[PDB]
Write a protein that binds this DNA or RNA. Sequence first.
DNA 1: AAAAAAAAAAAAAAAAAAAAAAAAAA
DNA 2: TTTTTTTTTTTTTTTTTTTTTTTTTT
Lengths: 660, 216, 432, 66
Amino acid sequence: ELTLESLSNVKANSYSEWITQPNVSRTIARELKSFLLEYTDETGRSVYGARIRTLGEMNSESLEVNYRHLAESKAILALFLAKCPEEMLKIFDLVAMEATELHYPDYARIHSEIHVRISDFPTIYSLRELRESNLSSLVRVTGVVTRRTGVFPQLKYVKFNCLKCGSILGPFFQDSNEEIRISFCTNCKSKGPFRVNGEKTVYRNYQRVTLQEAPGTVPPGRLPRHREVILLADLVDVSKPGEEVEVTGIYKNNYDGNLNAKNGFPVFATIIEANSIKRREGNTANEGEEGLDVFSWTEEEEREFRKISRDRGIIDKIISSMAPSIYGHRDIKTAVACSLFGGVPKNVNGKHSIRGDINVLLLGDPGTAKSQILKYVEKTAHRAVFATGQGASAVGLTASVRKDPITKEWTLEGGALVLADKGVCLIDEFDKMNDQDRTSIHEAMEQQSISISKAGIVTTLQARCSIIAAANPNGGRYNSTLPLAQNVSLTEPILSRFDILCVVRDLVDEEADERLATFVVDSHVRSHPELNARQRRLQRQRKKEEEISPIPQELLMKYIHYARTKIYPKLHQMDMDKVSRVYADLRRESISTGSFPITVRHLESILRIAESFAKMRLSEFVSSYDLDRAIKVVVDSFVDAQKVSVRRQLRRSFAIYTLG
Amino acid sequence: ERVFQISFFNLPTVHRIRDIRSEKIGSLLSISGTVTRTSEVRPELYKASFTCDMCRAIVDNVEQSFKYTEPTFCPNPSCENRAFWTLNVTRSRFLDWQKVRIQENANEIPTGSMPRTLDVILRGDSVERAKPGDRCKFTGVEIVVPDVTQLGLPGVKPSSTLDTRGISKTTEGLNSGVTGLRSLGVRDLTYKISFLACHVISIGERDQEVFLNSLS
Amino acid sequence: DDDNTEIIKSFKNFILEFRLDSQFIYRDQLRNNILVKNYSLTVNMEHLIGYNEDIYKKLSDEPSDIIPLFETAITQVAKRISILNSLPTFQLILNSNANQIPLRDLDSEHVSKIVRLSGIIISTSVLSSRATYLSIMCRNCRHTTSITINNFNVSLPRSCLSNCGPDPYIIIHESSKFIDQQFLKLQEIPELVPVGEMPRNLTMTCDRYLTNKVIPGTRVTIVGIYSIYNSKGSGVAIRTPYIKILGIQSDVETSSIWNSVTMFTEEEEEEFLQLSRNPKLYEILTNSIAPSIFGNEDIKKAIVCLLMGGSKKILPDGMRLRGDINVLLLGDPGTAKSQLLKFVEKVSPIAVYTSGKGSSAAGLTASVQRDPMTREFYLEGGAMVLADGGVVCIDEFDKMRDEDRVAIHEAMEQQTISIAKAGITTVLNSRT
Amino acid sequence: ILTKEARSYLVEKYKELRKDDASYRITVRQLESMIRLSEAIARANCVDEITPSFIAEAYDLLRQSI
DNA sequence: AAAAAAAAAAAAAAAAAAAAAAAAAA
DNA sequence: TTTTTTTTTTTTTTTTTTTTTTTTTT
Ligand SMILES: Nc1ncnc2c1ncn2[C@@H]1O[C@H](COP(=O)(O)OP(=O)(O)OP(=O)(O)O)[C@@H](O)[C@H]1O
Ligand SMILES: Nc1ncnc2c1ncn2[C@@H]1O[C@H](COP(=O)(O)OP(=O)(O)OP(=O)(O)O)[C@@H](O)[C@H]1O
Ligand SMILES: [Mg+2]
Ligand SMILES: [Zn+2]
Ligand SMILES: [Zn+2]
Ligand SMILES: [Zn+2]
């Protein structure tokens, strides 16, 4: 037997042969199993044991292992994995399955093999800087998905049969990029016809994708580069055409006759076999964080969620934690939080569908940090799409029709509203936009679907998306002596579809200006860029978050994701008379004096906001406090969009409902 | 071992693209032109290695000129084998390869002219040093490249010169092709002039500690 | 052959000895089918499980191999209970109550296994011919030979039977028997598509008595076998999956040609005539239109009138008079205009829902396309072609472009679509 | 970086400018631009600390253009 | 001298549908 | 001024068929 000290010295003048030796491969497996079983973090809890426990619960087929953990301890194995992926991964999958069969015996009846997904590889390359020295090694490459072939079954253990000797050949592992070539018989001793051994075989899922370089990475004015990526089983359909992705994989080469024929030199083709996939569409928090999905939670994190969810005033802290560095504008923050958490969709007897998402509009003076709030919402949301003004078209926010280059049949392609299904679409400068482009979202805002009838395609899509829009008033500035209908160009059909409207006014006030200036100067002071040091960095970065954020942002992201995924509150016991009276009063005080369209569509927004406030508390039932808070929000959103003449009377008239 | 390269520069006289004649094939020259297209950095096969199917004997350092060339005689004369080898892609040595297209300069172009073009091959450490739109001076050796498709490429993928566009009828039979060789068969081999370059030149950090290092 | 005989015997005993109460149902169904020249048999899997579990287990793991044995058992029983012989091989149609699998959950784990799934028909191909009995002759010795083929996936012998060439054999087309083959295309249910994904499609093959049974746009339930066929895509050793249909359930009673005949048993006709005699049937029908919408009684009455439709007349001089009703709703936002359009789509047996913003004249009336293989031009239907004999609901009608809206003028009244493009000059029917 | 008295001088100058404007032309962006100009003027003198004289110069430059 | 296997031979192109710009006007 | 109008721009080849005529290969 060998020791971790003995793996340092190498023989055979090649690392692959050194790894594949029988004596070395027995020490490697034992060391990998010890790493899997005995690793503990700072708090003292084994992480891979918990991951294995969750694997069986979720009926998963893959295990995620961080490269930093295996590099910090047993760094020689980390170097071996870095240089020689193919041989290390076969052993590591086997040891992973052996470790898994210590928590779930008889798990082989569910899945027969456990795959390992590597995460947080240190060195990141671009497609432009790939050379021949990276051949047969693990690489990390960012790109943009362009085209996807589709899922087909592929042979796994290939068999052959020869007729004159009737010989059956042993199973062959297919390279997945090179056809199995066999010409010699162990029995026939000569060339013979070979069959595929019809039936009695094992298949795998296979797919192929093309990655172009991201426009941001490409130097301005230069042509992009592309490469081909092969996705095997458990990795199919994860990436979608149009998204931006980061892939960790193995860089390989193969001989192509056409490439040699056209160029005129013995050049080879290259392709990447994908190992790990991470989505980066809309994510600017990629600067930090560890893992393949930063919106996923562990068991202790869920327990912490349920612990902090029962504190009184959780809603106040959640609201205060929205865009902490922006000063004031608490109504905007409340509307943003309500939109982010969202309502509950409904279907009554399978024939009547009711939408459950909140849309927000921000109409305000220039220089009031609306765009920064939109950027914060983009960063925090799980799925987010951004658009602005004249840069969007009718079919750029909807589905488009294209001729498939391969199949040559008319096909549907995605858009901004489809890329943000169960997400958020943000539209900055929503008033500086063509009417034909603006009117394309009428169906998606309410019916949450898209219908296309073009070139023989008659289909209906699904876009369960929420819209937060920012606009400027006529003349660039809001006239408080005029009603709303003469401060904007939008008509009733599009104004009715919005749930919350926030009018932002800039007024002269010495104390307010002094406080805002002090806050902004302190913020600029804070953001100036000037045990293990890598954790000293974390503690210093947490100290700065302590002042202005009641809860950390990374915790809040997982909190929002868990709340949206798991909770579905109901409305069993509530006061119908109060809501009916509020709706009737709001309808009466609109035609008499007002220019804010109120229909039945605004009655349901109160219930949606109540369900959102219930979601904020991780409660399964809506209480009276949440409904009262929703009524107060709706009433304050209507009173503050009036003329200065009647606002004082309307506020007094509507004040009886919001007694608390 | 490090596959070495020798780079020559500062030649006495420079040539234009329209001075390229077949009587300088094999000579060391320097040329100037404007780059208009570059390709990817592909790996080229330099020193091949194979294994006999039956003996499992290993052959190494099989030179290749312009097409995939496998060995002929097995290392052991006891074995009789003419073909059926298996490339050991891991043991083989590779090199970087790039093809760039250049055209004539704005001044060398006559009053009325359709610009002439050329194919320049950059190899080794000289990849990506020429960017489209720039004016660069290359230096290297003028070579000639045959048509490998009719030289019997192993795979069926070439499929005997599959084409998507129609060839010129004017030069049908006018382009002098040589015949007679056994590898060709009854086919006719054709040649075209390209350039191979060994040296390229162009003729058209807020950190205080590192900044203080560079200055004298 | 020593196991196939016992399998056929077991199937024949199942057919001849199954009884519930006091009637051999599967013995009577065969005789009733033979009389009206229906050469097929429908078997429920629950009965087969109840009779013997080994027989069910044999079928569940080797369908393509076992099913023809049941096929020949049926026609052996038929010749015994019908004749003391122009009876072709019968067909087996299966019914299942197992869980339905989504299309996107079908993968390499489900190969060569019987599955149950549901989707939407988008296209139906033309009928093609497949050989079952082949008469064969050799090019040199010239002697007769025969071959029998079953469609559960063969070639002429690569030899000679009694110098002749390598594989010398030709087909004598007369005295050969053929059947009917059809190809269909499926698609996912719109509400079951995952997040951010476009719907995917699949290919199915139907034979003999299951051809001309569905029309595009129909929602169906399919029972069949998930298989693969090697063909042709630069991947190595990849195959294309498809489904061979064994049983079809369709919501719309209409066949491919909509025979305009009654498909209602007397037990339902009695119910319908009893309903028609209700003195307050008008109120009952009106109250059933969108019970979750308050008020708007006149609009609901108009919707009922549109659903029933008027009468159509033809005159001696060739005149044709329209018998369909069109309705326009021009109103204020928030008045439930768009919640009635989607209800009419659900209630109507044939109905299409479209939006005026995402539409075009070619997509609404008809389009002309080029076949990649044949490289000719053919006509493809549109929204008003699919919704023939039904209702089309056009939302956001005011947002339509002025070029696209004018293409509906002829279809609304003359109920025809005239195409005069690319050497194709035809007039298509459209009664919507 | 910014010192202790520099922040007080900055807020005082912003308040004075806002008072003199009267909110039509002066916003938070003007204060941010004044901070930027002060930092640039500090970079000119090769000094890593900001003195209220720099803020006074930036304020004069802003006033000269309004 | 007599078998089994393996490529050449393609060619072709108008006619229509959808989407984004760069010039016209109630 | 925001509406309508207008040119116009790639969209194309991945497939076929059984003879007929060539090279290898017992
Ligand atoms: N409390 C605050 N109110 C307004 N602006 C603030 C505040 N705190 C900081 N700022 C800064 O003021 C600047 C003005 O913000 P921003 O550019 O979003 O304004 P805007 O007029 O809403 O933008 P746009 O026209 O792009 O929608 C930003 O640099 C922002 O960071
Ligand atoms: N009379 C009503 N009874 C019940 N629900 C109603 C009624 N009127 C409107 N609603 C509700 O109002 C919401 C919006 O209605 P809908 O989408 O049908 O509007 P619409 O008439 O199509 O508007 P638009 O003119 O803006 O397109 C739905 O949730 C619908 O259930
Ligand atoms: Mg509507
Ligand atoms: Zn053999
Ligand atoms: Zn040998
Ligand atoms: Zn014969």
